[PDB]
């Protein structure tokens, strides 16, 4: 059962700075079937990245996903106030989908 | 009941300046007179005091040995002689009458700005590190940011590690060059005004304060540090 | 392309509740549909999934034998029947379309809070 | 002494819903019972009240004609029937025992969330106008900006002028085409996500509120306007 | 080319209303006709759309399940049936011809005001808490202020503590009475229009939102809260 | 103590409308009830009055013969039946309780807007004359300006002279064509939105009010006049 | 570089760092000393941008000459409070507390009322 | 490329000060050098200019006759001699190299503050008159208010009338005493900090500017005036 | 008391006096001259509080060395514009225009971008 561990748990940054988020799996993620979601207070999660590196429709270029195997990273090039939220990674390579515990960017 | 201050201005480091404060409306010859200063964007800070003949004159550790408070009671005038000035003396200086239990600092001069600087225009390259703190576990990745207010020519930017009680240790120079004996898990990147230090998989010995440093001009500056705990 | 969720609320322990998710803008009859929940202050947690006729429906161990996922393709509606509710089932429940390699959970319902307390 | 609440959940606009509150530990039939709500992120707001056999019941002005409070003393139960629900009713609803001079709202239910919504989003194109306010003199140039969250296909963006008490007036459509009768001093430009309206030489009759408008999909959206004063 | 509107007015919450829009000067039967509304002081907002026989009719999310757009091409008339009206529906409503790439909303009606209200005031007792936010450390003292627009008879004013995700908890009632179980560090005081809550020594569990509450009449009101963080 | 008003809206000239005002909190059967209206951007104006059934209902000359005030004391309701409406009736109408020496208009309804109009979202062509007044002597030149809010098609603009107590007299039509019998010292010019009437050498018989007039559409409008003294 | 002993000046901590209020509202400012302030020799000053500090309160509670009655100080020992009962638009400034009970005068770091 | 400034400070009115600016990094002997100043909370203002061998120095009209710009090319230093200083000279003064078409003011000194004051902070009683303007007709009453920041001891407050081009006239002194020859329609009242001047029935000769004046201390102050038109 | 003014000075009027914007948005600043500025000798400066002005644009359109490309100037004669394409948090400051086409240099009164 693939465990996803995100780090750091909390990132305190200012507008204009870059946020680098890490998702590390206990096993290799087949086909790089890993996704990133953004969730703001009181709202449903919203897809940012899928297939490790594919940017969803409508997602600004400032969001970028990379990595493979067991090490994945989400990078936000220039943080805006609407980017401060909690971010979850998600692997869908097997029959037991699992999520990271989230990284809150504040 | 007034204090008319004069003096101040812009002076080079190591220079001298004399402040004066002319009193009227009270028995100046008997009054305790103090100097108080206020650095730009900071709070009030006591500087010196002088009183009757028979009492001690007092100075703050910041100025004792360089500043001299004095008074000429025949002209109802208070003086502050400022010698061997340093950039840390930059502040607005106030003369004030001290009334103790009868009013504390009840009369203030209007204040005069003393700026101690050899600089020009004129802006040193400011380095801002982000985030201020990173809490991580062994094995995880640490990504540190250093952004400069101006372009760092030739990418002359270095990264140092400092553990408590020890001298800084060179990790990266020329933005991307790993120093001899530094493990390959340390790597730097970036150019111009955007630089990054990455520690790929943290070890328990990597928890320390990390500083970036630009040496592309005659005025070297450091970032304020990122603590990885 | 949206999922309109309904249902939820505050229920006693051991009570029952049915959640609904009405789809539009895509071929719902062919889509894999999942339920995901998030207890207050915690992270996302997969609950259940249903797909085409001829595939197996799946449940997390925490709801297996108590929850039933179902769909009405003629009405483009997804259901979650929640029985034998406990305080640990308290969470915001989301319906979501699963696109796999073509976008993972690319469409989410807005979520409804289910609180189990007496 | 406790109030056990039940009901609530997610419904669509125009829907109906009934909340319940079962009391225990006190003589319920003698107590005044209130409903209080709290919209997400906002404060507490009184909703309704009910009391003894000669029920003189009260409602907040917003819910009058839509909500009905009632009670069944044989069951020790308080009810709140909620009809004609809209998005402004989205809140956590509490039942509460009112003790007045002996405790105010001394006993509260744990609260149930009621959410009125016809769909998750909300995934529309967001237009952001800048600046919100322009203070200019006649003869000057007004440069108004309209930024879109996504690319506006076919550059289907329009500008409107609205004076106090009057209907909006089309100025520009297709990003840059002047409507018939619009003077040459108005001009629109831009494409993709960045559009501007420029009024070259402001006349006294040009001071009003200006809105941008995208019509490139089935969910038309407007900017929040720029006031030229 | 004109759109002549009619209807609207003042109705109570939960009421119903029908707007009309008679067209002339163009081929109305083939035109796409929309309704757009504008709340007082706010911007333009799309409401509904109708077009040719064989197309879809569209509604904004907030009005779905409450409003119905329709047309009678034999009489060149557009309609909007408005049901389940609430205060959020108060706006000037416009009918407009949609021309798409040939003029967007190139023709507007003059607009009719719809006001949904069960009363005209307003004369409730307004509680104003200060400050909105208090950033303090454990062991410090928090002094919270609650000012009423009119005198609170009998000093029927209560204070509540609310933590995130929990129901409010009674702290003080009758301006100065500590509820049973409330620690002695909390204390209320004041009378008439000026009331204060004092937390003498902040514990970590004391950081929450605090509301005042007057119950001196039939229209209970709360303060908007003070967050002690 | 409250008056809940309802009704109003946008209606055609000559149409009918009924306003209602529901009272609570006082002995409505004994109270004198009035209607008061307020035209857009104008002051308050009394409309009608009703009292006990042993007194007479009263109306203002503006509405007498078309409006009917009435009351149903069993429903605590006040009515205003508005028939044969005209654009001059456009106003916000208030119901109000009249207390005479015990409070004048101490309770007001919130008011409902009644707009009486047959037009669309476009405005008529507005003519602005300048200056409002010209003080001159015989032999001097008078230059009068007429500016239109929209371009006047075909230059269909006329100028009239009106002396006190007499009908207007045509001076110029088609912007520049001098009418039969008009002295050559009168001459008009301009096109589009800028028109001028020039009197080359004033005579004592030329001192009068002068109006411009556009007849380029079905809605004729006049300027507000320039008085030559 | 120091002339003092193991000794420790009296440290003044003001709270909160910032107060955002409206005219007519109450402003309550706290000053907290690390040691007892002998004789309650504690003063409060008001400072507006670009101007010299102005004495408001001395001896903890004594209102200086010309200071409106809406300003009042209280407290003793290590706990002091400055209260502005109803803020006026001229009251928005930085406020400092100040202890003069020994040879080493010290100031609080200021509370900004905006 | 640097400009190192020195000098400035706090001086009394009528005093003198000299500013200096030492250049490095460019051929100072070829460069045109300017002085620019900036009053507190104001904009930039050019002061003086100097160039090469054929000394062709320029000054602003505010300083012509009081300031002297000079340069010593052997020390690469620019000077500004400031005589006859007044509070209107209070500003931050910048030296700057002028590059014209090759950079305008491309190099600036850091600036030094020059403050010209005799100790002015304000014990003076401030008088505020209201309203600033009053439009009334003959026969109406004019009520004018004068408010003092501190109590006016002995009610030593006077009122003056001033017509254009004429000296003020005493109307009222000692708050309520009518001066010799003043018609009874003028009357003053009030005490402490609240004073009023009343003109019972305006005459056509009463339309003028009215000033209040306190003489209760050694710093006399006037109100800023009320115009009655 | 006057030295002969005045005068022939070219008056520069900046508009608006204030612009309230967010990071990422466009700032468009206007400078209007009372008379034609010969050779388009018009410059733009940025000034942050407590610091000397910084040259942004000279010769109406020339971006100074080290100035980011998001700053751009344009216009001629009597109508000049400074455009900040997408505001950064360090771009919020006061901006002055400046004409140096004659012997009497003048500045605009500044536009504050907050």
Author numbering:
A (entry chain O): 1 to 106
B (entry chain I), D (entry chain D), E (entry chain C), F (entry chain L), H (entry chain F): 1 to 229
C (entry chain P): 1 to 118
G (entry chain J), I (entry chain E): 116 to 229
Task: Copy out sentences from the published article reporting this entry, exactly as the authors wrote them.
Therefore, the two VH-linker-VL chains associate to form a dimer with two antigen binding sites, each consisting of the VH and VL fragments from the different chains.
In monospecific diabodies, two identical VH-VL protein chains form a homo dimer. Note that the diabodies we used had substantial sequential diversity in their C”D and EF loops.
